[PDB]
């Protein structure tokens, strides 16, 4: 069991 | 005072390992799903692929067995359990989803073991394809939207 | 001959109860922290969550009071008091730790009451997130490694 | 001889500690479980011996005020059956009036784990109030 993290991103600007 | 027991276990024998990750303190950092920049209302489906934090390409799981091993992949629902990115300052949310195939059809259903195969001496990539629905309604507030999906390579 | 007294007490009135446990004989069996299979030397932090023995998900503590009750959670150091899993046959040990938050930051310090809140008519889950450091040094011997952490839901 | 630490002299009777199960409702489904807290320091009873060679001392606990290990409500006559075990997994029971063996080395504190355990009460709701008992622990040689 290898659980990790996946950072999700979105820059709502222009 | 209700005291109970929690049995801890680990089978050190011939397991499978996940490459492409970096150890962020005590939690594996698998990668980033960077949709990029966008305006308030986007008509096109915003779409980006996971970038492994260690090498910049896809997560490359390899197994240590000689025979083909069938390992599973499960992704959770994010910080709020409904796959929504949240603005760092305001309370605006941006609904998204992660799919397994390049055509956004085979969805990584929340807390589900999407099956996978791996041969001896190879790197089977784990495609985590992100996808966001068109936002032709309200313009979400300016700023940075984030989420931390926990990917669970389990056997 | 030194005989003394041990006062026994129990306040039956409006207490708090812990769900997700099974009564193993005369000791509550709260769950299992299953890291899974692994090889001698693992480069990725091995990480798994507690699975309640009664329902397979997280331990779901509920209180019987109408007002919010603030209950605490304390986990001990395991069989050898230093959080090490021991091989069933050999004397090899595998150091580990249990954290409270999904990002492996808020550690359940040994014999410490990590605070918790619970509202009337709800199941507040007790996340016991396990984490093991990368073993890029010596390959620990083959077999099964175990430990029995005693979780202490106390008020 | 050998001496028992962690106790306080309550008048003329050693006060070894408290087995505090905590608060609970009428009917509890989970086994209520708590450890003895020494009255002097708040942790376990720490027996030490004064000999240079290892001494083998015994520990015996009796059946409580009513000799059947039942806590009694201070006001009503309701009873709550319980038991004290020696190991953390509630298996090695401190049988009534029995010398459960123990070892102690020179210059160390061998703790006496008195692990309490109460069976699930999924039948009748016992009346509200405080239930008590006074187990007499007998460190004898």
Numbering used by the authors:
A (entry chain D): 1 to 14
B (entry chain C), C (entry chain B): 1 to 155
D (entry chain A): 15 to 155
Question: What does the report in the manuscript say about this coordinate set?
Answer:
Adhesive pili assembled through the chaperone–usher pathway are hair-like appendages that mediate host tissue colonization and biofilm formation of Gram-negative bacteria. The formation of this biofilm is mediated by Csu pili assembled through the archaic chaperone–usher CsuC–CsuD pathway. The Csu pilus comprises the major subunit CsuA/B that forms the pilus rod, adaptor subunits CsuA and CsuB, and the two-domain tip adhesin CsuE that binds to various substrates using exposed hydrophobic finger-like loops. The rod-forming CsuA/B subunit deviates from the standard Ig-fold and adopts an unusual architecture featuring two prominent hairpins A′–A″ and B–B′ protruding from the β-sheet.
Here, we present the cryo-electron microscopy structure of the prototypical archaic Csu pilus that mediates biofilm formation of Acinetobacter baumannii—a notorious multidrug-resistant nosocomial pathogen. The structure of the Csu pilus rod was determined to an overall resolution of 3.4 Å. The Csu pilus is a thin (around 23 Å) left-handed filament with a helical rise (z) of 28.0 Å and rotation between subunits (φ) of −153°. Pilins are tilted around 60° relative to the helical axis and about 69° relative to each other, resulting in a zigzag appearance of pili when viewed in sideways projection. In contrast to their classical counterparts, the subunits in Csu rods are linked together not by one, but by two binding mechanisms. First, the incoming CsuA/BN+1 pilin subunit inserts its donor strand GdN+1 into the hydrophobic groove of the preceding CsuA/BN subunit. In the pilus, CsuA/BN+1 not only provides GdN+1 to CsuA/BN, but also inserts its A′–A′′ hairpin into a pocket in CsuA/BN between β-strands B and E2 and loop D–D′. Moreover, the GdN+2 of the third subunit CsuA/BN+2 that complements CsuA/BN+1 binds through its protruding N-terminal part to β-strands A′′ and B in CsuA/BN. Finally, residues in β-strand A and loop A–A′ in CsuA/BN+1 form several contacts with residues in the A′′–B loop at the bottom of CsuA/BN, thereby bridging the two main binding sites to form a continuous binding surface of 600 Å2 with 41 interacting residues and 13 hydrogen bonds. Thus, the clinch contact confers pilus rigidity and determines the trajectory of subunit movement during clinch formation or pilus stretching.
